[PDB]
């Protein structure tokens, strides 16, 4: 319902003052937190560094497991190949031996049949002597 110009300061480069249109509707004035120390700051920064270091370490640990699996695959492929070679070697050895035994047995039985005939021929000729010169 009026105005009030209140001179503040006048210096070489300018002037300043306060203009009050209306005073406050409340006279009795209005109706920071320490610190943080260097130690507190260092603690927060170092805790974050250790979390980052943990994350990276755990990611390298995962990759290390992969290298282990890769070596395990290669080794499995070696093992499977070696088992194939050994089973083929043994099965072949068995076939070649079973076959030698069978072939030997066939020939053995054949010669025994012929040997029986030779024993019978001796008996035939012996039987002839029991008849011939024995009677007249």
């Amino acid at each position: 319902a009026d105005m009030e110009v209140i001179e503040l300061n006048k210096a070489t480069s300018g002037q300043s003052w306060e203009v009050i249109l209306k005073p406050p509707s409340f006279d009795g004035v209005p109706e920071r937190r320490r610190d943080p120390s260097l130690e507190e700051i260092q603690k927060k920064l170092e805790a974050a560094e250790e979390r980052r270091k943990y994350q990276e370490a755990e990611l390298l640990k995962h990759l290390a497991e992969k290298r282990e699996h890769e070596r395990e695959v290669i080794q499995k492929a070696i093992e499977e190949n070696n088992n194939f070679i050994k089973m083929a070697k043994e099965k072949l050895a068995q076939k070649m031996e079973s076959n030698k035994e069978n072939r030997e047995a066939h020939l053995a039985a054949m010669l025994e049949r012929l040997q029986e005939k030779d024993k019978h021929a001796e008996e035939v000729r012996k039987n002839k002597e029991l008849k011939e010169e024995a009677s007249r």
């Binding site: 290390a64 992969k66 890769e70 695959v73 290669i74 492929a77």
Partner: protein, 431 residues
């Protein structure tokens, strides 16, 4: 965060990798002898990201060329830009991978992997500030797939604080080299979910359909498909290579594009879609370029963006155009197609504008999207995988290398878990 170490593995890896180097060398004014002959200082501001500076003001790709088969790297050496590569950076074996992930990951590949790491170490140790690694490979074969993922995990162990970025090409029966592709891709996806920070899903099914349906090519070749790949790879790397507004590195891309660690498979998109013989077009305005971000026909992954929701999008506009028009048009697409963006990631679309257009084009737009619709690509691979795995068809080729049936079961469930996670966020509402 300046240098990127590029690695190309296997047949596909080296084909798309060589095409990337031919295209970006042309943009940067580098000829096949490594000499600069351009007329813009923007072309050399960030050359250091992909090229090493050699004596006699020449530039050499920071590229490592890997394969278990010697043949492919002879084809590279004889190519247009074949002479530009460091000869010591060619790491080739003599017995291939026989399109078997197990051979690439555990047998032939495991024997060559240390020779590759020696070359990566030499490149990486020379870097002022290593950003990370960019790998090109296919997931359908043996070397790119098996050996590429073995390289990833070995690089992850040696450089855990560096970004691992891949351009992984997905198999399709429409362009198939081998019957065992679904096994190879599943075993790889499992590795990518765990060991990469960001992957660009280059789907051969999507590339085939672009050529056939859009470009009307009755019988498209690998050359036709690779034209789309090189255009995408150039677009997607624009902000790593050229100065402007955001700077941009592989970590910044990862941070802003990946809200959940496992969900790091990007669905790239490009406009305009051209063929090699397409020497016109007399086409595409700013509103037209912006509209192609929801167009399934422009996606490099065989997924419909309209079947999911975008978690995040990064968009590159290339050429002389109104940056004000781009901003207006991009906001319009978000306001009109609001239901295809996740509401719980505020302002999830970022736009970049580069004055330099790619070769043969006066204006282009590339979209890098982290969409829940990418689950369609993983569901497709899983269906193919189970059709075969149910019958244990071709399994002896893997178990013969020492693998267990268990690894197949684990990779399959990890890919199905990836699918369920994309679904979880597609249904998730802001509450």
């Amino acid at each position: 965060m300046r240098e990127i170490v590029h690695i190309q593995a296997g047949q596909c890896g080296n084909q798309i990798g060589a095409k990337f180097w031919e295209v970006i060398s042309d943009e940067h004014g580098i000829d096949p002898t490594g000499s600069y002959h351009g007329d813009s200082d923007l072309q050399l501001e960030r050359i250091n990201v992909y090229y090493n500076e050699a004596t006699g003001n020449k530039y050499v790709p920071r590229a490592i060329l890997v394969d278990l088969e010697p043949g492919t790297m002879d084809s590279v050496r004889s190519g247009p830009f074949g002479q530009i590569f460091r000869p010591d950076n060619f790491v080739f074996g003599q017995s291939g991978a026989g399109n078997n992930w197990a051979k690439g990951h555990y047998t032939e590949g495991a024997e060559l992997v240390d020779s590759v790491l020696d070359v990566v170490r030499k490149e990486s140790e020379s870097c002022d500030c290593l950003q990370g690694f960019q790998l090109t490979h296919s997931l359908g074969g043996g070397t790119g797939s098996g050996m590429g993922t073995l390289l990833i995990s070995k690089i992850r162990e040696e450089y855990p604080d560096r970004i691992m970025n891949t351009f992984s090409v997905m198999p399709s029966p429409k362009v198939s080299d081998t019957v065992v592709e679904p096994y190879n891709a599943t075993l790889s996806v499992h590795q990518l979910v765990e060991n990469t920070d960001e992957t660009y899903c280059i789907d051969n099914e999507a590339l085939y359909d672009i050529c056939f349906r859009t470009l009307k090519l009755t019988t498209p070749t690998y050359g036709d498909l690779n034209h789309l790949v090189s255009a995408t790879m150039s677009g997607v790397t624009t902000c790593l290579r050229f100065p402007g507004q955001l700077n941009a590195d592989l970590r910044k891309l990862a941070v802003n594009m990946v809200p959940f660690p496992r969900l790091h498979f990007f669905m790239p998109g490009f406009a305009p879609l051209t063929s090699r013989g397409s020497q016109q077009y007399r086409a595409l305005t700013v509103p037209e370029l912006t509209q192609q971000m929801f167009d399934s026909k422009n996606m490099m992954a065989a997924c419909d963006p309209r079947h999911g929701r975008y978690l995040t999008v990064a968009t590159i506009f290339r050429g002389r155009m109104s940056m004000k028009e781009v901003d207006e048009q991009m906001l319009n697409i978000q306001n009109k197609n609001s239901s295809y963006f996740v509401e719980w990631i505020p302002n999830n679309v970022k736009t970049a504008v580069c004055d330099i257009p790619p070769r043969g084009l006066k204006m282009s737009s590339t979209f890098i999207g982290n969409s829940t619709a990418i689950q369609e690509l993983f569901k497709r691979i899983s269906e193919q995988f189970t059709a075969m795995f149910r019958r244990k068809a071709f399994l002896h080729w893997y178990t013969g290398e020492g693998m267990d049936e268990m690894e197949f079961t684990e990779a399959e469930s990890n890919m199905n878990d990836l699918v369920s996670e994309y679904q979880q966020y597609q249904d998730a509402t802001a509450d």
